[PDB]
Nucleic acid binder design. Sequence first.
DNA 1: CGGCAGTACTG
DNA 2: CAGTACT
DNA 3: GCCG
Length: 320
Amino acid sequence: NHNLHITEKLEVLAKAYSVQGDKWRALGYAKAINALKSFHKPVTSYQEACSIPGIGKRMAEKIIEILESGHLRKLDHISESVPVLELFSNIWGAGTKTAQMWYQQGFRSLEDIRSQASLTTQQAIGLKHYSDFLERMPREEATEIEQTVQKAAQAFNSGLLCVACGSYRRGKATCGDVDVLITHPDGRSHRGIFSRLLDSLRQEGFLTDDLVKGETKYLGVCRLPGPGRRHRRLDIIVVPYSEFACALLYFTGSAHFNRSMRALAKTKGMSLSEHALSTAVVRNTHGAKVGPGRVLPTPTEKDVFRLLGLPYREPAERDW
DNA sequence: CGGCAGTACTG
DNA sequence: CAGTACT
DNA sequence: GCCG
Ligand SMILES: [Mn+2]
Ligand SMILES: [Mn+2]
Ligand SMILES: [Mn+2]
Ligand SMILES: [Mn+2]
Ligand code: NA
Ligand code: NA
Ligand code: NA
């Protein structure tokens, strides 16, 4: 990154807007920061600032105040609430609205939350694992978690296919959680497995707490056996084989990669989700879907790229 | 002016 | 439904 | 915040 001296300061304001609930302004900052981190050379002119997609007049002005003065005075007017709102919204299950409500009610520390706040079931689990959930794990440990789920799944049906997606599949050295996708090539035997699979993982002691238990999605907490182990977040999705390619693409990410690709599809009158790539989709003047269109056959990830007119990218080049 | 991705849970 | 979460 |  040629522009750490710029992006380091803009990241502060981006995080401030985000925890205060100003999601679209934070998005614009997030995109500009990416754009700046991907420029070869230092940005050296307001004229050169507007040069870059994602950088407008306002952002170019901020970047020159930085280069001219080495500082951005807006940083000096960030609300004193922001560090506390960040502290609170790092509880899993608590977002901007809950953080702001706790702040208005007078809470300032996790001790205040522990002793006085009303917590949902999810948020109490988040708070108990507050430190662990902020830690990333070595990818070697993500491998061990993937293999634990796979062995429990294969015990029921040898045919079950299990793959760790997310940051793991994109090749990152550390992983925030493990994202495991499960399917069955026979198109049928993925059905109703969560019952037995989660109970198998729970009877082990591996699965320690459940956050979301849906028909297709599980989000929870696991811990490998032995000393020196931390609790780790584990996400599992079970999908029919016909949706494997789109589910794999979705679950491998990155999030910004997915959003960019789905935006591309929309410009082309198509729609991309974890279920399918569809064409001939009818939308209104607000970009909202009002006609469903037709599902396109996508037996592999490469087919999704091809149908969108894009060169294929391996998971490691999706790490946007 | 107004979209900025598309979807799944929880309560 | 609003809120939060996933990539 | 940016952009069509
Ligand atoms: Mn992940
Ligand atoms: Mn995850
Ligand atoms: Mn722990
Ligand atoms: Mn993530
Ligand atoms: Na630009
Ligand atoms: Na949170
Ligand atoms: Na009090």
